[PDB]
Design a protein around this ligand. Structure first.
Ligand code: K
Ligand code: MG
Ligand code: MG
Ligand code: MG
Ligand code: MG
Ligand code: MG
Ligand code: MG
Ligand code: MG
Ligand code: MG
Ligand code: MG
Ligand code: MG
Ligand code: MG
Ligand code: MG
Ligand code: MG
Ligand code: MG
Ligand code: MG
Ligand code: MG
Ligand code: MG
Ligand code: MG
Ligand code: MG
Ligand code: MG
Ligand code: MG
Ligand code: MG
Ligand code: MG
Ligand code: MG
Ligand code: MG
Ligand code: MG
Ligand code: MG
Ligand code: MG
Ligand code: MG
Ligand code: MG
Ligand code: MG
Ligand code: ZN
Lengths: 37, 176, 73, 231, 122
RNA sequence: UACUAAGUGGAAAAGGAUGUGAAAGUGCUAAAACAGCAAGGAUGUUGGCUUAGAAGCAGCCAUCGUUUAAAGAGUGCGUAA
RNA sequence: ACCUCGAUGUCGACUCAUCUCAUCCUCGAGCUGAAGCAGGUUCGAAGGGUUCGGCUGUUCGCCGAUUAAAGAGAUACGUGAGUUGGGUUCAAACCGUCGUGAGACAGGUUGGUCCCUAUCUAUUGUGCCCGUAGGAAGAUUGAAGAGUGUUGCUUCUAGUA
RNA sequence: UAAACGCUGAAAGCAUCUAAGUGUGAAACUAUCUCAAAGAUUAAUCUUCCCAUUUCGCAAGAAAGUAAGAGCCGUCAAAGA
């Protein structure tokens, strides 16, 4: 998981969700999990 | 939409007693109990072979509940009528599991013997040492059993070793 | 999300309790402290906070005083 | 939990040789038969405990209120009264000895009042370091250590509560845990406890079930001498 | 109890008459070294016909102590001089013979070669 | 009378986000909308230089045409290709 | 250049430490160009621990041998009514350099006085008086608290995955 | 409970750890371990013992008159300036 101030989809499969009042990015590729949006 | 989705059920064996906050579903299998949280913004109606859930307002949580409980009623009826099953492919070099009484024991790779207690209402069968089938009447309970069995050996990406799910593909890596 | 704080005169003696923990472990102390905070810093406020008998259950050893019953007060 | 307790008087320290070739220092405790003076129940009191009476004395050496209590409860007059928490299962007015309480080699802990030492300094009390003795020195050699936390209005400017300085040391209750009972002497009413017990010889001693190892009993057996008188 | 910067004798055939302790190997602030303890040392007095040279930093194990130590049965073993023998990584003695007696605490910590090459164990 | 769900109120920037409310336009939809599900998803050919090789998915020469509802010198993965 | 020139003792060392986290070790997890072992990065986490020496007044620094680790800072760059005075900075003397000179140099070197019996408050202990509503002697519950919390090696599991 | 991983599930027919419901999870937190603690004036609880006079008037009044216990003093040390 990558913690960045700005989170944006990397591929077309990356999907933005909002969990526990924090926006994260989930995808099939685990290299692209992002948080702290 | 799920909220405005028909729930056509045959009255052959499935009845649904609707109390204030206690929904009871009885059918071929065991009875399922659903709790209604207080001040539920959605009224059910019980016609002949058709249940329709309606709401009072256009609130966000109102729509969310309308969808969620339609899905919950669908899942309860299916489990009561035909149940739910999960399949785990336990694969490895010396991995094997079996069932003794109320405890399912596994020997994956651990010095300490691994045992796991089975909750009420769920039946786990082992036809082959590499195969596990968890059958129950509540979807979330069989899912919890599957995941807590999985937690001992999650499938690694370098080889196939682990407690895999059935028809579940993993991303392969080549560790030269 | 809201915390209640109590510091002893030592270092690190800051004890924190959440709203839920206060509502379960000691709820009488929470109501007592809340009422005390709404009083003027005074030498009579001690007696004023003394006259508040807060109980965590339906029972009370104060039935000998014949206390009148009023709602929402 | 199921806590068992007995009271006695420490009489001294000796050693015993044991099988498996160990020399075990032991403490000897003279344990009088203790009398259960009261039982306090969880339902009626809000907690459960057992209070015994020990160190018996003649009636003329006891005050009027205590002898009245003893004659009201139909008990043997004793000058010492104390209780242990969570001690249940004993009927009022029953003589209790350590043989019925503990096993041959089970683990117990022991509480006793430490040997009084009086007004001691910081080094003897808090294991502090002594200042340098040579290469030039000053009046304070056995210095306690600088108690500065902050000098100036933006800092503490005060000695912090609970500082480590000189004061009273000794005559304080202390507990040593996981001591194995070695032997029982019914005729002399004498208990052998491994290790060292705090307190002066002749002081009171409380033997309790160890909370760290409640049911653990490590075997211990003594050695029988094979010697023979001169040939 | 041999401590830091302690001169002690070597009881083997290696050319080292006086050896100085550098570190009490094993942990942080390990104050003393009792019988059977391993230390790092430096050869300070040596001989021309010796396997070691003066100034080398090496590893040794102590076999004797003047202070002595007490065993479980209660016997207190006490020598009259602190002695150590030079050992190799494998825990094998560097010398071919051991002079004088050695303790039995070596037996507990392996060191079987040292015991078999000694004159008499105590 | 509306708004906020953050104790925001009750301190902050570049930047990021299917938080929510209001408004103004535009596309399709009961001649069926969107998502999902079930099917097909092509031929010359694997075009040709080019590259050990690429030929639906290396750089190119570009960035073909028919059948047909649709199909791309392909959407990726991927195959030495 | 706002406080202090009717005086706020300034480097380093010793003793005692406390606090913060931007975490050195221990603890948990995500990704890996993570086969295993050992790593890299990020996230959570401040309970405890965080070595001894050679040279230098030294902080710093280089080097030696260990350790799980030898963390970054703040607290008048903590701490002289707690210690020392090696350094800086009095008077003495010399070297290099500047000055015609008396003298001068964050150039170098040798030597060279560190006071105070604690009033208040803070703190460590120990008492008298009074209150707790009759008095006294005993045994208790526990609101609010304080103290400790570190970790390594070997064997087996298993030369198994 | 933090980080993290979840199961069942919609808003947003798919998907989705979350919104309802239900879990897992660190030497951190609350207890379990040791010590002290009712001056905790919000001054707690239990047990035992001793008071329960004659007169005058003025009553948590007087003159005398009633006990448990404690202190002063002495010998001391399991204690201690
Ligand atoms: K000044
Ligand atoms: Mg002097
Ligand atoms: Mg002196
Ligand atoms: Mg201020
Ligand atoms: Mg201040
Ligand atoms: Mg704010
Ligand atoms: Mg947005
Ligand atoms: Mg908007
Ligand atoms: Mg100006
Ligand atoms: Mg100032
Ligand atoms: Mg002045
Ligand atoms: Mg002054
Ligand atoms: Mg001063
Ligand atoms: Mg952090
Ligand atoms: Mg803790
Ligand atoms: Mg030297
Ligand atoms: Mg500064
Ligand atoms: Mg300073
Ligand atoms: Mg500093
Ligand atoms: Mg500066
Ligand atoms: Mg000072
Ligand atoms: Mg100083
Ligand atoms: Mg001085
Ligand atoms: Mg001062
Ligand atoms: Mg000087
Ligand atoms: Mg001097
Ligand atoms: Mg001069
Ligand atoms: Mg000149
Ligand atoms: Mg207090
Ligand atoms: Mg799901
Ligand atoms: Mg838990
Ligand atoms: Mg008053
Ligand atoms: Zn992606």
């Amino acid at each position: 998981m990558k913690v960045r101030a700005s989170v944006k989809p990397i591929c077309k499969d990356c999907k933005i969700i909002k969990r526990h009042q924090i926006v994260r990015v989930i995808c099939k590729t685990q290299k692209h999990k992002q948080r702290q949006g | 939409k799920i909220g405005n989705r028909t729930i056509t059920l045959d009255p052959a064996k499935v009845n649904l007693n609707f109390q204030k906050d206690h929904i009871a579903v009885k059918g071929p299998l065991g009875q399922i109990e659903l709790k209604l949280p207080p001040n539920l913004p959605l009224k059910f109606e019980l016609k002949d072979n058709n249940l329709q859930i309606t709401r009072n307002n256009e609130l966000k949580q109102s729509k969310i509940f309308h969808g969620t409980y339609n899905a919950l009623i669908t899942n309860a009826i299916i489990g009561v009528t035909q149940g739910f099953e999960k399949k785990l492919r336990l694969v490895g070099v010396g991995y094997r599991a079996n069932v003794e009484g109320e405890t399912l024991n596994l020997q994956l790779g651990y010095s300490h013997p691994i045992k796991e207690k089975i909750p009420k209402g769920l039946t786990v069968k082992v036809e082959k040492n590499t195969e596990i089938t968890i059958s129950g009447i509540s979807k979330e309970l069989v899912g919890q059993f599957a995941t807590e069995v999985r937690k001992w050996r999650k499938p690694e990406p370098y080889k196939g070793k682990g407690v895999l799910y059935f028809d579940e593909v993993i991303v392969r890596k080549a560790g030269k | 999300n809201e915390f209640w704080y109590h510091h002893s005169q030592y270092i690190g003696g800051i004890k924190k309790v959440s709203g839920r923990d206060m509502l379960k472990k000691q709820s009488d102390k929470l109501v007592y402290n809340a009422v005390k905070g709404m009083l003027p810093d005074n030498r009579l406020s001690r007696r004023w906070i003394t006259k508040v008998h807060v109980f965590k259950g339906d029972k009370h050893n104060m039935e000998a005083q014949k206390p009148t019953t009023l709602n929402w007060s | 939990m199921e806590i068992r307790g007995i009271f006695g008087v420490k009489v001294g320290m000796s050693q015993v040789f044991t099988t498996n070739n160990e020399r075990l220092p032991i403490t000897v405790i003279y344990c009088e038969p203790n009398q259960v003076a009261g039982v306090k129940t969880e339902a009626k009191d809000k907690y459960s405990a057992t209070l015994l009476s020990f160190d018996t004395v003649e009636n003329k050496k006891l005050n009027k209120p205590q002898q009245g209590f003893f004659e009201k409860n139909n008990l043997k007059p004793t000058k010492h009264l104390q209780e242990i928490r969570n001690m249940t299962g004993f009927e009022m007015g029953q003589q209790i000895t350590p043989q019925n309480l503990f096993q041959v080699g089970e683990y117990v802990d022991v509480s006793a009042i430490s040997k009084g030492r009086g007004f001691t300094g910081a080094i003897k009390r808090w294991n502090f370091k002594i200042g340098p003795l040579g290469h030039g020195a000053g009046y304070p050699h056995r210095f306690q250590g600088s108690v500065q936390a902050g000098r100036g209005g933006a800092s503490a400017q005060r000695v912090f509560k609970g500082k480590k300085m000189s004061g009273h040391y000794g005559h304080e209750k202390v507990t040593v845990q996981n001591l194995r009972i070695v032997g029982f002497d019914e005729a002399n009413m004498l208990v052998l406890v491994s290790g060292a017990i705090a307190g002066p010889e002749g002081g009171v001693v409380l033997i309790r079930t160890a909370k760290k190892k409640p049911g653990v009993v490590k075997p211990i057996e003594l050695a029988v001498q094979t010697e023979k008188a001169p040939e | 109890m041999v401590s830091f910067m302690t001169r002690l004798n070597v009881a083997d055939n290696t050319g080292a008459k006086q050896v100085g302790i550098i570190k009490v190997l094993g942990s942080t602030r390990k104050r003393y070294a009792f019988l059977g303890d391993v230390v790092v040392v430096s050869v300070k007095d040596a001989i021309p016909s010796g396997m070691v040279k003066k100034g080398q930093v090496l590893r040794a194990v102590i076999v004797r102590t003047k202070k002595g130590q007490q065993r479980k049965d209660g016997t207190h073993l006490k020598f009259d001089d602190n002695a150590c023998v030079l050992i190799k990584e494998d825990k094998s003695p560097r010398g071919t013979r051991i002079f004088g007696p050695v303790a039995r605490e070596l037996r507990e910590r392996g060191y079987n070669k040292i015991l078999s090459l000694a004159v008499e164990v105590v």
